[PDB]
Amino acid sequence: NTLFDDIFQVSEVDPGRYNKVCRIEAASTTQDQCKLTLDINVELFPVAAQDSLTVTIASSLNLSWRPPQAGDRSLADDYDYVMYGTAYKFEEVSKDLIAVYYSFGGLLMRLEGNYRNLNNLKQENAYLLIRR
Amino acid sequence: EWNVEKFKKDFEVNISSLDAREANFDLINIDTSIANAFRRIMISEVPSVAAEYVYFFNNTSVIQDEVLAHRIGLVPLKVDPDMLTWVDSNLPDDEKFTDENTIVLSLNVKCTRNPDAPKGSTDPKELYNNAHVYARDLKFEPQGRQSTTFADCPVVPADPDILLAKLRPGQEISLKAHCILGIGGDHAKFSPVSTASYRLLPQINILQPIKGESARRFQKCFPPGVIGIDEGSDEAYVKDARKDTVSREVLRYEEFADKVKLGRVRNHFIFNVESAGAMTPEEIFFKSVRILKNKAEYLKNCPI
Amino acid sequence: SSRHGQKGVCSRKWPTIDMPFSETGIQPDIIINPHAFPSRMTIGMFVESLAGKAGALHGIAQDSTPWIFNEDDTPADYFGEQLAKAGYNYHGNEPMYSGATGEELRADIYVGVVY
Amino acid sequence: EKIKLLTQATSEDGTSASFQIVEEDHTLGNALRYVIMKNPDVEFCGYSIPHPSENLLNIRIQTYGETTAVDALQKGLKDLMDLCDVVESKFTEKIKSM
Amino acid sequence: TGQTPIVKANLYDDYGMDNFPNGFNAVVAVISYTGYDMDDAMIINKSADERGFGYGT
Amino acid sequence: MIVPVRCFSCGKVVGDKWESYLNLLQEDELDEGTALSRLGLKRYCCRRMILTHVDLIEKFLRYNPLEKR
Amino acid sequence: ENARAEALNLANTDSQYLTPTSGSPVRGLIQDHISAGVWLTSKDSFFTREQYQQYIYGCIRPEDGHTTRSKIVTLPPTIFKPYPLWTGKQIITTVLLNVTPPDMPGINLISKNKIKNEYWGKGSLENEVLFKDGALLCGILDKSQYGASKYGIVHSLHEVYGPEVAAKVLSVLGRLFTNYITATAFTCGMDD
Amino acid sequence: RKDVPKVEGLKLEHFATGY
Ligand SMILES: [Zn+2]
CA D31, D35, D38, D43 torsion-angle sign? negative
Distance (Å) of CA G135 to CA A109, G79, G126:
17, 16, 15
Tally of structural domains, chain A: 1
DSSP string covering A66-113: ----SS---GGGG-SEEEE-EEEEEE--STT-EEEEEEETTEEEEEEE
Q: What is the dihedral of CA D21, D25, D27, D30, to 10 degrees?
A: 70
Residues spanned by the domain of F59: 1-66
Ligand 1 mean position, distance from CA C27 (Å): 9
DSSP state of C103: P
| Residues 6+ positions from G128 with CB-CB distance below 8 Å | G110, G111, G112, G138, G139
Q: Does B182 touch chain F (CB under 8 A)?
A: no
Phi, psi dihedrals of residue A98, rounded to the nearest 5°? -160, 145
Q: Is G25 helix (H, G, I), strand (E, B) or coil?
A: strand
- Among D34, D77, D85, whose Cβ lies nearest the Cβ of B300? D77
Query: Which helix or strand (DSSP H or E) is residue E6 part of?
Result: none
Check if the beta carbon of residue G43 is closer than 8 Å to that of residue A15: no
Measured CA to CA, the distance from residue E18 to residue F52 in angstroms comes to 10
What are the chain B neighbours of F15 within 8 Å (beta carbons)?
Answer: 71, 74-75, 159, 162-163
Q: Nearest-CA distance from F31 to chain B in Å?
A: 23
What is the separation, in whole angstroms, between the first and last Cα of chain C? 9
Where chain D is broken, by preceding residue (C–N > 2.5 Å)?
none
Least Cα distance to F9 among D15, G81, C62, E28 occurs for: E28
D26, D30, D47, D49: best to mutate for the C interface, most C CBs within 10 A: D26
What one-letter code names the amino acid at C7?
K
DSSP string covering chain B: ---HHHHHHH-EEEEEEE-SSEEEEEEES--HHHHHHHHHHHHHTS-EEEEEEEEEEEE-SSS-HHHHHHHHHHS-EE--GGGS----TTS-TTTS--TTT-EEEEEEEE-EE-TTPPTT---HHHHEET-EEEGGG-EE---TTHHHHSTTS--EES-TT-EEEE--TT-EEEEEEEEEEE-TTT-GGG--EEEEE--EEEEEEE-S---STHHHHHHHTS-TTTEEE-SSSS-EEES-STT------GGGSSTTTTSEEEEEEEEEEEEEEEE-SSS-HHHHHHHHHHHHHHHHHHHHHS--
**Interface size, chain C vs chain H, as Cβ–Cβ contacts under 8 Å:** 35
Q: Nearest-CA distance from D90 to chain G in Å?
A: 28
What is the separation, in whole angstroms, between the first and last Cα of chain E? 11
Measured CA to CA, the distance from residue E54 to residue E43 in angstroms comes to 13
Return the bridge partners of A130, or none: A55, A81
Q: Within a 13 Å sphere around the CA of D14, how many CA atoms are in the beta-carbon half?
A: 8
| Residues 6+ positions from C96 with CB-CB distance below 8 Å | C20, C21, C22, C23, C104, C105, C108, C109, C111, E29, E31, G185
Return the bridge partners of E3, or none: E23, F53
Resolution (A): 3.3
Query: Which helix or strand (DSSP H or E) is residue G47 part of?
Result: strand G46-47
Q: Does E56 touch chain B (CB under 8 A)?
A: no
DSSP state of G100: S
Measured CA to CA, the distance from residue B165 to residue B109 in angstroms comes to 11
Ligand 1 mean position, distance from CA F10 (Å): 4
Phi, psi dihedrals of residue F67, rounded to the nearest 5°? -135, 135
Residue F45 annotated as binding site = yes
Q: How was this structure determined?
A: cryo-EM
What are the chain D neighbours of G67 within 8 Å (beta carbons)?
Answer: none
Domains of chain B: 1-47+189-304 (3.30.1360.10), 48-188 (2.170.120.12)
CATH code where residue F28 lies: 1.10.10.60
Check if the beta carbon of residue G74 is closer than 8 Å to that of residue G56: yes
Least Cα distance to D62 among D44, D37, D76, D38 occurs for: D44
DSSP state of A19: S
Q: Is B81 exposed, middle or buried (0-12, 13-18, 19+ CB in 10 A)?
A: buried
Q: Is E27 exposed, middle or buried (0-12, 13-18, 19+ CB in 10 A)?
A: buried
Measured CA to CA, the distance from residue B197 to residue B286 in angstroms comes to 15
What is the separation, in whole angstroms, between the first and last Cα of chain A? 20
CATH code where residue A94 lies: 2.40.50.140
Measured CA to CA, the distance from residue D37 to residue B2 in angstroms comes to 10
Phi-psi region of C92 (alpha: psi -120 to 50; beta: other; left: phi over 0): left
What one-letter code names the amino acid at G98?
N
CB E1: neighbour CB atoms within 10 A?
A: 20
Q: Does C21 touch chain G (CB under 8 A)?
A: no
DSSP string covering B247-278: ---GGGSSTTTTSEEEEEEEEEEEEEEEE-SS
Tally DSSP H helices, then E strands, for chain E.
2, 3
Q: What is the dihedral of CA E37, E41, E45, E49, to 10 degrees?
A: -160
Q: Which residue of F has its CA nearest to B72?
A: F5
- Work out the angle between the directed axes of helices F32-39 and F18-26 (0-180°, nearest 10): 130
Q: From the CB coordinates, do chains C and F have 3 or more pairs under 8 Å? A: yes
Least Cα distance to G72 among G172, G139, G189, G185 occurs for: G172
CB D28: neighbour CB atoms within 10 A?
A: 23
Q: Within a 13 Å sphere around the CA of B97, how many CA atoms are in the beta-carbon half?
A: 15
DSSP string covering F13-24: --TTSHHHHHHH
Query: Which helix or strand (DSSP H or E) is residue C39 part of?
Result: helix C37-40
| Residues 6+ positions from A37 with CB-CB distance below 8 Å | A23, A24, A25, A26, A108, A109, A110, G123
Measured CA to CA, the distance from residue E5 to residue C56 in angstroms comes to 10
Tally of structural domains, chain F: 1
Domains of chain D: 1-98 (3.30.1360.10)
* Cis preceding-peptide flag for G102 (omega within 30 of 0): no
Q: What is the dihedral of CA B171, B176, B180, B183, to 10 degrees?
A: -10
Least Cα distance to F7 among F48, F46, F34, F33 occurs for: F46
Question: Which chains lie within 8 Å of chain E at 3 or more CB pairs, if any?
Answer: B, C, F, G
Q: Nearest-CA distance from C2 to chain D in Å?
A: 27
Phi-psi region of E52 (alpha: psi -120 to 50; beta: other; left: phi over 0): left
Least Cα distance to C59 among F13, F8, B249, F38 occurs for: F38
Q: Which residue of G has its CA nearest to E37?
A: G32
Check if the beta carbon of residue D51 is closer than 8 Å to that of residue D57: no
What one-letter code names the amino acid at F44?
Y
Measured CA to CA, the distance from residue G170 to residue G147 in angstroms comes to 10
Residues spanned by the domain of A100: 1-132
Check if the beta carbon of residue G78 is closer than 8 Å to that of residue A20: no
Q: Nearest-CA distance from C32 to chain H in Å?
A: 25
- Work out the angle between the directed axes of helices G88-99 and G49-60 (0-180°, nearest 10): 40
Return the bridge partners of D97, or none: none
Measured CA to CA, the distance from residue G58 to residue G180 in angstroms comes to 10
Measured CA to CA, the distance from residue G164 to residue G157 in angstroms comes to 10
CA G119, G123, G126, G127 torsion-angle sign? positive
DSSP state of D94: H
Q: Within a 13 Å sphere around the CA of B208, how many CA atoms are in the beta-carbon half?
A: 10
- Among D33, D77, D87, whose Cβ lies nearest the Cβ of B296? D77
Cβ C20–G185 below 8 Å, yes or no?
Answer: yes
